[PDB]
C-alpha cells in the first residue's frame, strides 16, 4: 500500500503573551496510513489529557488531525510537538516558536 | 443527512 509522511505544524490558537492562558496546537496532515502518535511536550516531558479532532481526510485521501491542549506560555518554559508515524525512522520533535 | 444506500464491493 501507499505511505505518506506527515506535515507537522506546532502553534498557538492566539498570539502568545507570557502569563496568559491559550491553546497549544499540533496540526498533522497529509499522512497515510491513519495510525499516528502525537504528543505535546512541556520542557521535554509529555503533557497529559491532550485532546484531538475527529479523524478526517483530504481529496487525495491523506489524513489530518489537530491535537490541542490548554497552556500558559512563559519566558522559561519550552513547548514542542512529538510525532511518530511508520514513514519516520524515529519520533520527530518540532519546537514551538511563538512567531511560526 | 447520511447516505442511506449501502453497497458491498
Amino acid at each position: 500500500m501507499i505511505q505518506r509522511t506527515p506535515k507537522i505544524q506546532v502553534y498557538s490558537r492566539h498570539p502568545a503573551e507570557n502569563g496568559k492562558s491559550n491553546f497549544l496546537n499540533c496540526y498533522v496532515s497529509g499522512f497515510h496510513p491513519s495510525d499516528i502518535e502525537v504528543d505535546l511536550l512541556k520542557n521535554g516531558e509529555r503533557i497529559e489529557k491532550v485532546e484531538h479532532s475527529d479523524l478526517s481526510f483530504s481529496k487525495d485521501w491523506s489524513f489530518y488531525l489537530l491535537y490541542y491542549t490548554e497552556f500558559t506560555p512563559t519566558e522559561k518554559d519550552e513547548y514542542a510537538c512529538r510525532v511518530n508515524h511508520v514513514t519516520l525512522s524515529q519520533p520527530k520533535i518540532v519546537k514551538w516558536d511563538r512567531d511560526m | 443527512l447520511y447516505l442511506p444506500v449501502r453497497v458491498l464491493i
Binding site: 500500500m1 501507499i2 505511505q3 505518506r4 506535515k7 505544524q9 502553534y11 490558537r13 492566539h14 498570539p15 491553546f23 496546537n25 496540526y27 496532515s29 497515510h32 496510513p33 491513519s34 495510525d35 479532532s53 475527529d54 479523524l55 478526517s56 481526510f57 485521501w61 491523506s62 489524513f63 489537530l66 490541542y68 512567531d99 511560526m100 | 443527512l1 447520511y2 447516505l3 442511506p4 444506500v5 449501502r6 453497497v7 458491498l8 464491493i9
Partner: protein
C-alpha cells in the same frame, strides 16, 4: 457563493485487536457538524455543531442507523478486499469512503460525489454524470460489474440529487449564523534579522473563515515566488483558520516588499507593507 456537504468515513482493520475502527465525520463547507466513532461509548451519531444539537430524536436515531449500518458494511468490504487482493488477515488495511453534494448560491444542485479508496489509493468512484463508474484496477472492475447489475448508480443519484441537496439546503438555513458568516483575516507583519544584511518579513492572516485564502509577496510590484516560505492553512481550534507567508529580504530594503491578501471577507485585495 457555492456550498458543499461532505461525509468522510474511514475503516481500519486492527488484526488481533478486535473489529476494525470506524470513524465518520460530516461537514458543511469548512465546518464539521457530526461525528461517529466506533471506539466511543454511545454507538451513536453525535453532534459537533451548536446548530445541529436541537435535531429531534428521530433524526439522531435515523442517522445513527445509517452510519452504524455503513460501518458494518465497510467492515465486510475490508474482508472482500482481502479476497480480491489475496491479502493475509494479519495486516492492517484501510477503506475510505467520501460522499456528498455541492449547491450553487441559488440552492440548485451542482455536483454529486460517491467514492472509495483502498489502502490510500482510488478504488472506485461514481462519475460526474452519476450514471457510470470509474474502476482503478481489475478488482474494482469486478465491483463495477456487480454495481451495474444491481443499478447502484440510480440509487446513489436519487440521494445525491434529492435528499443530499435537501439536507444541505436545510443545514445552510438552520446553521446560517455559523455557515453563512465570513470572518475576514486579521493581519500583522513581523520582522526578524537573520544576518548582518538580511531579515525575515512574515505576513500573518489570523481568525478567518472560510479557510480559502491567498497570501503572496511582491518586490516593487513584481510577484516574488522565490526566497518565500508559505505554510499550509491550519485550524485555530475556535472555528477560524490561520496562515503565514515569509520572505528573506536585504536589510534596508524592507519597504520594497508588499504582502497581498485575498479572501472572501476582503471585497478588495489588501496590501501590507512593513511599518
Amino acid at each position: 457563493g457555492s456550498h458543499s456537504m461532505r461525509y468522510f468515513s474511514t475503516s481500519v482493520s486492527r488484526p488481533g485487536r478486535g473489529e476494525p475502527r470506524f470513524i465518520a465525520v460530516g461537514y458543511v463547507d469548512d465546518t464539521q457538524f457530526v461525528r461517529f466513532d466506533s471506539d466511543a461509548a454511545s454507538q451513536r451519531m453525535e453532534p459537533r455543531a451548536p446548530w445541529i444539537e436541537q435535531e429531534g430524536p428521530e433524526y439522531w436515531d435515523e442517522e445513527t442507523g445509517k452510519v452504524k449500518a455503513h460501518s458494518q458494511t465497510d467492515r465486510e468490504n475490508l474482508r472482500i478486499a482481502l479476497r480480491y487482493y489475496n491479502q493475509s488477515e494479519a495486516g492492517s488495511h484501510t477503506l475510505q469512503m467520501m460522499f456528498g453534494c455541492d449547491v450553487g448560491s441559488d440552492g440548485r444542485f451542482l455536483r454529486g460525489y460517491h467514492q472509495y479508496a483502498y489502502d490510500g489509493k482510488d478504488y472506485i468512484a461514481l462519475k460526474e454524470d452519476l450514471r457510470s463508474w470509474t474502476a482503478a484496477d481489475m478488482a474494482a472492475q469486478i465491483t463495477k460489474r456487480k454495481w451495474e447489475a444491481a443499478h447502484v448508480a440510480e440509487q446513489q443519484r436519487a440521494y445525491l440529487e434529492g435528499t443530499c441537496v435537501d439536507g444541505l439546503r436545510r443545514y445552510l438555513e438552520n446553521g446560517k449564523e455559523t455557515l453563512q458568516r465570513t470572518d475576514p483575516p486579521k493581519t500583522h507583519m513581523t520582522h526578524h534579522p537573520i544576518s548582518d544584511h538580511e531579515a525575515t518579513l512574515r505576513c500573518w492572516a489570523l481568525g478567518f473563515y472560510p479557510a480559502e485564502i491567498t497570501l503572496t509577496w511582491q518586490r516593487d510590484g513584481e510577484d516574488q515566488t522565490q526566497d518565500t516560505e508559505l505554510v499550509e492553512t491550519r485550524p485555530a481550534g475556535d472555528g477560524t483558520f490561520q496562515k503565514w507567508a515569509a520572505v528573506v529580504v536585504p536589510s534596508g530594503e524592507e519597504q520594497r516588499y508588499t504582502c497581498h491578501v485575498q479572501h472572501e471577507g476582503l471585497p478588495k485585495p489588501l496590501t501590507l507593507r512593513w511599518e
